[PDB]
Structure formats: C-alpha cells, structure tokens
Design brief:
The structure is cut from a larger assembly and holds 3 copies of chain A (371 residues) and 1 copy of chain D (55 residues).
Chain A lengths: L3 E3 L6 E3 L9 E3 L3 E4 L14 E2 L2 H4 L4 E4 L10 H16 L8 E5 L5 H13 L5 E6 H8 L5 E6 L4 E7 L2 E2 L5 E3 L3 H12 L9 H14 L6 H10 L5 E3 L7 E3 L2 H4 L17 H11 L5 H6 L1 E4 L8 H12 L8 E2 L7 H11 L8 E2 H7 L10
Parallel strand pairs in A: 1-7, 7-8, 9-15, 15-16
Antiparallel strand pairs in A: 2-3, 4-5, 4-6, 8-17, 9-10, 10-11, 10-12, 13-14
Chain D lengths: L1 H53 L1
Classes of the chains: A alpha/beta (371), D mainly alpha (55).
The structure holds adenosine-5'-diphosphate (3 copies).
Subcellular location (chain D): Cytoplasm, Cytoskeleton
Organism (chain D): Homo sapiens
Family (chain D): Belongs to the tropomyosin family.
Chain lengths: 371, 371, 371, 55
Amino acid sequence: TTALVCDNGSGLVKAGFAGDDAPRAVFPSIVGRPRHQGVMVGMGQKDSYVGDEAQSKRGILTLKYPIEHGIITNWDDMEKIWHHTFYNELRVAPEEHPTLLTEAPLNPKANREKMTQIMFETFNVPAMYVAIQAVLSLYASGRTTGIVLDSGDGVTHNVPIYEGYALPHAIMRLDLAGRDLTDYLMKILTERGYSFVTTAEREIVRDIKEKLCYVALDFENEMATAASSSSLEKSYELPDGQVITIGNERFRCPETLFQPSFIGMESAGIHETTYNSIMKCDIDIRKDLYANNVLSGGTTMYPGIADRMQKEITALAPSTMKIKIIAPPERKYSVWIGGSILASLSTFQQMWISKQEYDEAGPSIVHRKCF
Amino acid sequence: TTALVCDNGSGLVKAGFAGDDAPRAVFPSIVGRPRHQGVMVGMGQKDSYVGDEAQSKRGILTLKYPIEHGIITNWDDMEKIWHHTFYNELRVAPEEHPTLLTEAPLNPKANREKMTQIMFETFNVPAMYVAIQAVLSLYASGRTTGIVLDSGDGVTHNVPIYEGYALPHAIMRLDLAGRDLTDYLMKILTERGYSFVTTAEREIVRDIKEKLCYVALDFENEMATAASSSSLEKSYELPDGQVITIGNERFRCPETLFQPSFIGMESAGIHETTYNSIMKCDIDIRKDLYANNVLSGGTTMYPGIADRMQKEITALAPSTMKIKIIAPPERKYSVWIGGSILASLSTFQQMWISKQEYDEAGPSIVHRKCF
Amino acid sequence: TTALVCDNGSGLVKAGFAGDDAPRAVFPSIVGRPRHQGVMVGMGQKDSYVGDEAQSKRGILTLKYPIEHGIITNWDDMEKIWHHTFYNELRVAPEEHPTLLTEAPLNPKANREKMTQIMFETFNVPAMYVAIQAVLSLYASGRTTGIVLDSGDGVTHNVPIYEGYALPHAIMRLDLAGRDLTDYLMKILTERGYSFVTTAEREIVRDIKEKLCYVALDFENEMATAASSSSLEKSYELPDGQVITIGNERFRCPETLFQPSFIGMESAGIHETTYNSIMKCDIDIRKDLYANNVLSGGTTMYPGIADRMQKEITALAPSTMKIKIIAPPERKYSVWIGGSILASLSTFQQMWISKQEYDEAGPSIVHRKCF
Amino acid sequence: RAQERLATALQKLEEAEKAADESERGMKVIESRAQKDEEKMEIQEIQLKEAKHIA
Ligand SMILES: Nc1ncnc2c1ncn2[C@@H]1O[C@H](COP(=O)(O)OP(=O)(O)O)[C@@H](O)[C@H]1O
Ligand SMILES: Nc1ncnc2c1ncn2[C@@H]1O[C@H](COP(=O)(O)OP(=O)(O)O)[C@@H](O)[C@H]1O
Ligand SMILES: Nc1ncnc2c1ncn2[C@@H]1O[C@H](COP(=O)(O)OP(=O)(O)O)[C@@H](O)[C@H]1O
C-alpha cells in the first residue's frame, strides 16, 4: 500500500505519492463558474471548472479561492478541489490509500476537524494525518535543527526546532504573503496607467510578479538608481499586446515583506519576526538557530531575498555570530518533499489515524496524541 | 416531424426545412400594389403581388418593404409575406411544422412578441422559436468562439462569442447596410446623368451594385487610378437598352461601410466597430477573437472586403497577433444554414415554445430563457 | 490675492473663487467640432466650440469629452477647456491667481505631472496645488472622520478618513459612473423602440436620466409592480416633439450601481465596496465609519439612493451598529465647496507649490510633501 | 514562400530576443552580485585592519 501526500496551501494544490522525488500534480486551487449568458444550445457546458482547466477559460469564469489565509472558507469548493485531485489529476481510488495532509501553525481547530471529517465520510480514506508545514520543510532540508520561514501564498510563519523538539511558544504567524503582494502590485501598477480589476486579471498580475519582481539589497539606493537611470525598466507582453513597462515596482512589490507598512499592516518584516522568534527561544540554542535559517515556500523565490534577509538578520544579531540562510532551488516544493519522506518512514506507520479510531472517538481524535 | 427555418432578414426571405444544406425558397421580401387604373375588363387582376412576382410586374406596381431595419413596420404586409412563403413557395401546412424564426440583436420587444402572436394565432403552428442571427451564423461556420459580423440588408451587428458564451455588453449594432448603400449609389449615379427615382428603379440600382461594385484595398490610390486611367470603368445594360458606364463609383459605394460619414452618419466603420467590440470584451479572449473574425450576410459579398477588413483591423490591433478573417463563399446563406443545423439538433427539441405554454403564459413567454 | 478653485471633474467643469459659497461657472467639459461642410460664405465659422456653446450648436457638432475616467486623454482639448474657463467664463488673468485643482485617487502620475506643467508654463499661474476629491467632500460636509463615497461621472471611489488621517490601503476605486449609466440607458431604451446613437443624442439621454430615473428600494418588487401596474410610466418630450414613455427603465438604469453585472462588470455594488473598505479599516474606527457615511458627486443624486444604500449596508453590517448616510442637498458641488474652504484656510498658504519650487525641481515636485 | 520566410524570420527573432533578455537579466543579477561583493569587501577589509591593529 502507498500513501498520498496532498499539500494544499492557499493557491496551489500539489499532490502525489509517498516515496517520490516530486509531486506529479501541481495546479492552482481555484474553482471557476461561468458568469455570462450561454447561447449555443447543445454545447453541453458544465457549471464549475476546477484546477488548471479554469485557467484556460479565465475570460469566461469568475475565479474563487476556497482557502483565504490557510483557513478553508468554502467547504463545497474544497470538496470539489479534492475530488478533482483524487480522480482527474492522480487517478486513484481514495478508499484504498492513506492520505497525509498539511496545514499551517495556529489555525482554527474546526478547520482541521472538518478536514478529517470530510476525508473519512466523503472520500472514505482508510487513514489520514495532518502535519505542520514547517516540520516537513525541515525534513526535506536534511536537518533536525533550525528556524524555518515558510512563506506560502496566504500565510507566513516561523517555527524554531532544535534536535527535533519544536518550541511552540516561539512560533510566529503572519498573514502577509503572495496574495497580498499580488494585490499591492495591482494597486501600484495603476501609477503607470495599467488597470487590472477582474479576478482573471489578478492571474495576469501574478504571472507578472513571478517573472519580473526581485528583492533589492538596498531599497533606498535602488529607488535612487531607478529614479536616475533607466536600466531597470523591463517589458512584459500581456495576452494581447500593449507591452507594459515596469520600473521600480519590480522591487517595490516584494519589499512589502520587509516593510509591511506599505500595505497598512502594523507588524514587522520577515527578517524581524525571524530574529524575534530567535530571541524568543532559549539562549543555548540561538547559535544553531542563527546558523540554520531555512527558507521554503513560493514567496521565498524572489531573486535576492536570501541575500537581503542575511544582511538584515546580520545587522540585527550580535557581531560574533555567523548567520547562514539555507535556500535550496526546490524551495517551492519543500513541504511536499518532506511530507513524502515522512509518510514513507516505516516508523510513521503507527502514527496514522485509522478509520476505526475515528469511528469510535469522533473528529476530536485529531488534536489528540494522534496529532 | 420536421421543422421549418424561415430566415426573414430584411429584403430577402429564405425558407426551407430543417436538415437541408440550403434554403429552397429565396425571393425578395417585397409587396407590390398596382398604381395605374386598369382598363381591360375580364383581366381579373389581383390587388397585391408578393415576392418574386412583384419583381416581374415592377413597371406597374409600387414596391414596399415590410421590414425597415430588422424591425417590421407593416404587419399586414409581413403576414402576406409569410402566407406566400408557407403556401406558395414551400407548399406546406404550417399547423404541422414547428417554425424557427430569426431576429437581429437589440430590436424592440414588441417585434418579437407580435411575431410570436402571429405565428400562433394566424398560422397556428405547433411550436416556434426566435433565434439570433449571429449565433446561427457561428453554428454554420463550424466555430464555437469568434466575433461575427452579420451585415444583412437592414442592419449590421457584431456579436462576440467565446466557448459558446455570448458577451451581451459587447454587442454592437449599426443601422448601415445594403439598403443605405443602394440609396447612396442612386444618389451618386446622378453625377453622370443617370436618374433612378422610382421605387422600381431601386431594384435596377441594386442589381448594378451587386454586379459591379467592389471594395478598394486603398481608397486614395483607387481614387487617383480612376482619375488618371480608365481601366476600372465598366458598363451595364439597363432593361431598356441604353448602356450606362460606371466609373470610380464602383468602389465609392461600398466604401460607405468603412466611412459612414459619406451618408452623413456619425458612427465608425465596420472595421472599427469590430475592433471596439473586441476591446470591450475581456483581455484573455481577445487573441481568439482576433483569430476567429467571421463574416456573414449579403453585404459582405463584395470583392475585396475581407482583404480590406484584414488590413484595417491589422493596422488597429497590436502588432504581435495573427488577425484572420473567415469569409466562406456561401456567406449570404450562413444564418439559414446555421438555423437548419440548430433546429435539427436533438438537444434543441426541448427549447421550442410549445403552443400550450403560449396559451397559458401569453406572448410574454418569448423573452424567457428562450431568449 | 485670491485663489481659484477649479474642480475640472469629468463631464462638468466647476470653477470659481476661493471664499465663495458656490461655483461661479458650471458648464459641461465638452469640445465640439463641426462635421458638415459649411456653405454660407462670410459668416466666418470657427473650428471648435467648447463648453456651453457646444451644447447650443450641438446639432451639427461631434462632441468629445477630453477626460475619460478621471484621466485626461486629450491634452489639447483640455487646454481649450481651461482657457475657456479662465478667460470666457470667469474673466480673470491666471498670471495673478493661485489655482487649486482636484483629482481622483489612484490615477496615473503623468496626469498630475502634465497638469502642473501646463498650469505653470501655458498659463503661468503663480502657484498651484492638486487635491483629492474625497478629502474636499469631507471638508465641505463639516466632518473630520467618515467614509466618503464620491460618485462623479467617470469614477466612483471610497476614501475612509478618521480624525484627519486617511487609510490609503482601504481606498477603493471603481470605474462605473454616470457615463456608463447613460450608455446602459441608451442600450436599454433601444428595446422599447427609441434609438439614440449620435454623440448629440447621448446628451438627450443624459437629460432623460437626470430627470426621470430613480433608485428602487426593492428591485424585485418594483419589477413586479411595473410588470403589473402602469403607474410607474412617465413621458418625456424630445427636442422635436414625439414624446417617449419609459416604464421600468426608470429604476433599471441606476440599479447598475448596485448590480454592475448589468453592464458586464464583475465587481460589486457601491453598497458592497463601501462595506469592504470599512472592513479593511482598523476595528476600532468601524463604528464611527458606519455612523459617518458621506455621499457626494452627481451620481449620488438619484431619488432613493440614500435609503437604498442604508438598507443594504444595514443588512451587511452587524445588527448592533447605527448605520447612517449623510446626503446633503448640495451633494453635486461638495468637492468644489470643500476646495474653496481649503484654499481659503490660512494654514494652507504655505502648502501651495510655487513657481520657484517648480523651476527648481521640475514637475516631479507634485508628488512630494507638497502633494 | 514569402509568408513562410516571414514567419520563420519572426520565430527566429523571438528566440534571439529570449536569449538576449535572459542575458540582460543575468548581467544585472551579476552586477548586483558584484556591488554586494564590493560592499562586503570594504566591510571585511575594515574589520581586517581592526583585527591587525588590535593584534
Ligand atoms: N518565482 C517566483 N517569484 C516570486 N513569487 C513566486 C514565484 N513562484 C511562485 N511565487 C508565488 O508563490 C505563491 C504560491 O506559493 P505556494 O508555494 O504555492 O504556496 P501555497 O502552496 O501555500 O499556495 C504564488 O502566489 C506566487 O505568487
Ligand atoms: N454580390 C453582392 N455584392 C454586394 N452586395 C450584395 C451581393 N449580393 C447581395 N448583396 C446585397 O445584400 C442584401 C441582401 O442581404 P441578405 O443577406 O439577403 O440580408 P437580408 O436577408 O436581411 O435581406 C441586398 O440588399 C443586396 O444589395
Ligand atoms: N439629478 C440627477 N440624477 C441622476 N444623475 C445626475 C443628476 N444630476 C447629474 N447627474 C449625473 O451626474 C454626472 C455629473 O457628475 P459630476 O458631479 O458633474 O461629476 P464630474 O464633476 O466629475 O463630471 C452626469 O453624468 C449626470 O448624468
């Protein structure tokens, strides 16, 4: 028997089998519904497209995300997403496969409980288990000690771990992520006359961000050089034309991660919440944590983010300490890699939540020692 | 049973059976009445001639069209037209056949309601349905997306469709068509001395237009070519003899479609309303619309109109897209062909407006989801 | 010396002197050019009529709006508008008057830059300043907190202000306004038999809208009332006779503000973008914002819009809040009134942008602390 | 033939532009790497002079 590893996240579902090097099914977690009339009789069109199919018909659908900030807010849409993942992208019968799911730290309890209730009643899996994303990042990184910064698409968090013991009082969670960066980039593109208002134009803006944005090493000097020269201007070709020219908002967008006041948040940047989690930990492990600062998730994929975060954390920490930032090239999939590793471990086979345990104890079995 | 497909149009009636490759009754949509006194007793002549007989008796009758711009203005005349179509050209009993009628977008609602009321009370058909001309054109063209430009004899309209969904906010309708081109040709033919004023010389001018007019690929260059040479000057022989010679007004007539200021209209050419409909659609279907620009209707039958339309739309749209114009040889009958396809679709047999539905809900039942 | 408050708007220019109770000059922002040939020799026709004169000669002109959605698209036309305003309506010399100009939030930056370049070079004003329309509305309303909904003729926007501090991350801008309502009313009148196509008939339709349209308190009940009764129909007198009678089109036009899917937009109504801006704002000021919901601008002037928006926002917000909507009778001129107040304030006299500052720092000085 | 060669020249232009703009991105990330190198260099040379003087 094999276990499935479904890493949902907020905006990119990626699933596969336990024991592979990568997910075999990566698609956006969107559910589209047609918003126009529909004239051709006999077209036999459907009522809701999910996944990558909804990306080809953006000009006709209104796109919803069923997961806002880690939290699932539309259970019907999420059930559709899971059905698509099981039957159309993977082509497996979920009644004969254990399933490992992930979630972010410090979410509501009903999210997790309703998740397992769905997975047992509707999809009828034999076993299941929910894992923290940062722990799986640390498995895939090849470490057992380090502070992991997992910037996804809805939520960012730090989780310090030492020798396999997680320090729950030092976990930080921040609701600034790729979706907020996309909204900020849409808002500041209007300074040059481009306007993207539709949910289908949000995707165009996301592709722009992924392809052109980067983190500046020195924000003020980059602003000065963009004001003076014109060597930063880069062009992008929309699905039609009118190539858009992007100047300093190439790096003003991801700078929101280090200055969350740009989008009117009160909190501090990711470098500063990382340092604060460190100083929140004990004193005997701070050196190892400084030396094992692990990045993962898609929002950590900008060019220059590792160097920027090292500069900031080095300016913060004492001078006698060597700061190191681990940023693999397969960061975007680290949670899935770690999930596959963990589910393939033979020690883990006693940690699943079997269906009989659930039937006898209710969905409360999930927060129990069966974590 | 079989359904009839009556494409009323405005200036040419096209009727037939659902499931044929072409209409079997194409005749003008005119009703003539004698205007002289009539001396031979025992002649027993009729009081009104309909269809193709009026074109034989032109010199004695006053020809009236019962449809001005899509809209029906003379309901008694239109009822005569339908009676002629059912009983003399097709030779069928309309109380045994469903009837599919066509209409242009953005007409009055009383037009459609009174049409339904006539078809159920006077002719007593079992079912009926009113369809949009552009949708049926797209059926006959074999596409399922594409922006269709249906230039008939009363109206011109663009209707962008994507994946079988029509975008009503981007529908454009212009009241310039073949009838206005005929009037402009009557007017500018007086520069050479020929005078056509009678309602029956309009038919001669329409014949001249059909047989000699063409669209210039470049208007100033053809103006200069006609001013210098005489290689583009052609002759025509009236029903009386006395050939007439047509010079540069061979291409000044259909140029009114691209410069509606010639007839004192405010609007923009067909090449520009097509592009404005595109740019009013979404951003991520514009490439498909540019590539699937479908022409239909009789006023698109000029030589060179496809090449001109392509040159214009290509100069308008961004330089990185393939602009393609689909212009079949059986353009003039595309609406009827698509209507036959649609009425033969087995899925469609549940979209008819049955007679009992009408008897219970009044003529208002036409604007329901059968719209 | 006294200042000039020119609220150029988009579809109505309003000018006057700072310290007045109302604008002195109010005329449409229109530039007309003759489109016919002109035979009377010696009468000396001019080439472009601007302002209220273009509405008198409206029958033989093509009316252009130099400003589309807040944004200026024709700079030569706009210079003509400003020249007419300064010399032929106010009769002042701008070389000796500071000028306060007004702009909507979230416009391109080249808009303001070219605006000030023109005001300093073409008109040689001694100083100038560009203000936000919503802030000036809130001045004229006598508040210092409140969420202001400024619905002009091109753009609608919400700007939540608390205690004199504005929440920029909560500013929402929507490109649905009176011009789109006029276009929808044209397109929706066409189904009763009347057709208005020219730019000179757009003005007649705008007059019909202003004079007969209103907002229904309950859309479905008003639709049923119009479908059953006939007490809703009013008649209007075109500028040549031939009265037109409109029924449910009276409340079906401004309902587009609350259901922008009518014109194929995806966004949410004004009642919902207001609530979303409030919910973006910090939790401690939402009660005051609910209590200080300010309306301004010409499109907020329909009968029943305040009651409708209160019903909607009340159904949205928690049931323990006091929703209150401030709708003065002089709504349409609130931006100008606030502008006059602001420019007359004595604290404001060191916040102008002087000619020296401009010659020193270029047009970039507009976005500095001298905003 | 004219249309064929038009399209082929177009696709070759596309490929060349891809290569050239990728090279541009690479040289920009390289020169940024070089300025970061230089600033790290000045800092480490300064701590080097400090260490040597104190030693
Ligand atoms: N190369 C890249 N540069 C910048 N941002 C990226 C890149 N690739 C992906 N992203 C961002 O990462 C987000 C997806 O992150 P992901 O790892 O899918 O998180 P989740 O799985 O929780 O949605 C997207 O919103 C996207 O904007
Ligand atoms: N070969 C042609 N060239 C130019 N115009 C034509 C040609 N054939 C037909 N027409 C014009 O097309 C018009 C009829 O178009 P049609 O498709 O019959 O529309 P409808 O059915 O609504 O009348 C006539 O007015 C005629 O002038
Ligand atoms: N009584 C009214 N009812 C409805 N709409 C109105 C009324 N008066 C004016 N309008 C609309 O307001 C718009 C003008 O708004 P305005 O405040 O002038 O904005 P701007 O100054 O930016 O043009 C016009 O398009 C007009 O249609």
